[PDB]
């Protein structure tokens, strides 16, 4: 069974996730085969090489087997070389970026929640085009000699702003709406510290950094398509402060026609909750719910 050999790995909703899961199962099979051999050898000598009651002389005092030793350094080298090749193949596919994505999402991480913006939508069939860039609010952050290349540490111009934005709340989980079967581009920028953009169904995550360009970090990753609709939870993975465990989000995948209807509702001034209700979807997140603001059960 693949589920037993997956050890809890989600099946995946993207082709990159499927390829990553296939690599995981094969590597686990290879690791288990090696472990069984070594565990068997350890158990064999522990059960059959114990000191008997009818032995008086010490055993043979051998401590060097050159042909065996040279053989036991080549076999592990071959296994890692095979694994390295498939490792390189998979990461190249997972990190590949198409110059023409169909949906571009601006992911803004902060302490302690999320903000999702729709930068640009360009369907490959030409049935929906939308430019959500907001450059009149990106130029309002400039702060300027400056300690760093003429800029103060409060420059914040690296962040992206959009007309349609889903802002996370302490009593409202932010829900990101994406179309199924379309290429999605995620641009990650962090306001303050480092956060983690992890969708377990994506079988992939990347750290969200402040000033990613200045840190030589590639903050853009793409998925070829999402193969099924539904709701999938997302969690922060990088230690970001007091509420690192209480800033989860949800990704809602709907049909292309549904996504077009939802964007029109958002353009019509509707909030995220009521726009989702306009396309016959739950207004709030269903995989996760907001955490109680109370600091504990003893409060």
């Amino acid at each position: 069974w693949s589920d037993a050999l997956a050890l809890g790995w989600p099946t995946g909703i993207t082709p990159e996730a499927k390829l990553n899961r296939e690599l995981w199962i094969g590597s686990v099979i290879a690791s288990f085969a090696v472990g069984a051999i070594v565990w068997g050898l350890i158990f064999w000598t522990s059960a059959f090489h114990r000191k008997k009651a009818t032995d008086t002389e010490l055993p043979r005092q051998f401590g060097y087997n050159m042909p065996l030793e040279l053989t036991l350094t080549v076999i592990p080298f071959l296994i890692i070389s095979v694994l390295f090749y498939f490792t390189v193949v998979v990461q190249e596919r997972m990190m590949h970026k198409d110059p023409n994505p169909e949906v571009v999402i601006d992911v803004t991480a902060f302490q302690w929640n999320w903000k999702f913006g729709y930068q640009k939508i360009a369907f490959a069939d030409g049935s929906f085009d939308y430019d959500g860039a907001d450059p009149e609010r990106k130029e309002a952050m400039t702060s300027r000699v400056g300690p760093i290349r003429g800029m103060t540490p409060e420059d914040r111009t690296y962040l992206n702003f959009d007309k349609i934005e889903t802002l996370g709340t302490s009593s409202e989980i932010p829900v990101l709406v994406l179309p199924a079967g379309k290429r999605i581009e995620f641009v990650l920028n962090s306001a303050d510290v480092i956060h983690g953009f992890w969708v377990p169904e994506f079988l992939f995550k990347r750290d969200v950094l402040p000033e990613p360009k200045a840190n030589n970090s590639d903050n853009v990753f793409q998925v070829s398509e999402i193969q099924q609709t539904g709701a999938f939870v997302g969690r922060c993975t990088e230690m970001c402060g007091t509420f690192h465990a209480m800033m989860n989000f949800e990704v809602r995948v709907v049909e292309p026609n549904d996504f077009k209807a939802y964007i029109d509702q958002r353009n019509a001034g509707k909030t995220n909750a009521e726009a989702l209700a306009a396309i016959n979807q739950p207004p709030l997140a269903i995989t996760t719910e907001p955490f109680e603001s109370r600091r504990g059960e003893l409060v």
Binding site: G146, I148, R149, G150
Partner: protein
């Protein structure tokens, strides 16, 4: 007929001390790559009319420090004291020269909170200056021990290992001086 245990312990520690300066060097290079074209940026104006004579004094201190080692290996405690006192004075002049450079740099707007360049410049050079001050303390402590007992081979070993630290400090500054004032 046997290696000097104190010399081996000092050289081994001196090698580890270099990794401490490796971290400071990494910070300077990381900030230099993010400069954007200005390194050092305004209003920082490095002047070589003072750094070069200060650097030459520290280099000359190594030669007089080596002269004290020759006297120490010769068994001449008085020759060791004369050369190490001279080395201490020039080492003190290096600290005063660096501080006088620091005062003018601060007045012109180059400070640790002022700019990223000020942070790396003062941390790299300031920590080296702390090492120079520690070396000056070693000279005083060693010279004070010369007035306590007769000049023994173990005492001559202590003089040699102190010069090892002073030579290490001088060599590190040459790397710092070339990297900061010439490789901009």
């Amino acid at each position: 007929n046997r290696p000097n245990m104190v010399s081996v312990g000092t050289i081994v520690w001196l090698s580890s001390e270099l990794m401490f300066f490796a971290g400071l060097f990494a910070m300077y290079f990381t900030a230099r790559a993010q400069a954007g074209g200005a390194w050092p940026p305004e209003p920082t104006e490095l002047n070589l009319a003072l750094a070069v004579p200060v650097t030459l004094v520290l280099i000359a201190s190594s030669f007089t420090c080596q002269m004290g080692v020759f006297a120490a290996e010769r068994g001449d405690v008085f020759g060791l004291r004369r050369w190490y006192v001279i080395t201490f004075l020039m080492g003190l002049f290096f600290v005063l020269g660096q501080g006088y450079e620091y005062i003018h740099l601060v007045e012109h707007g180059t400070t640790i909170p002022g700019s990223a360049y000020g942070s790396v410049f003062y941390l790299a050079t300031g920590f080296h200056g702390l090492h120079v001050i520690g070396g000056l303390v070693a000279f005083v402590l060693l010279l004070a021990r010369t007035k306590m007992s007769k000049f023994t081979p173990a005492q001559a070993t202590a003089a040699i290992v102190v010069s090892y630290y002073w030579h290490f400090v001088d060599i590190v500054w040459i790397a710092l001086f070339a990297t900061i004032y010439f490789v901009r």
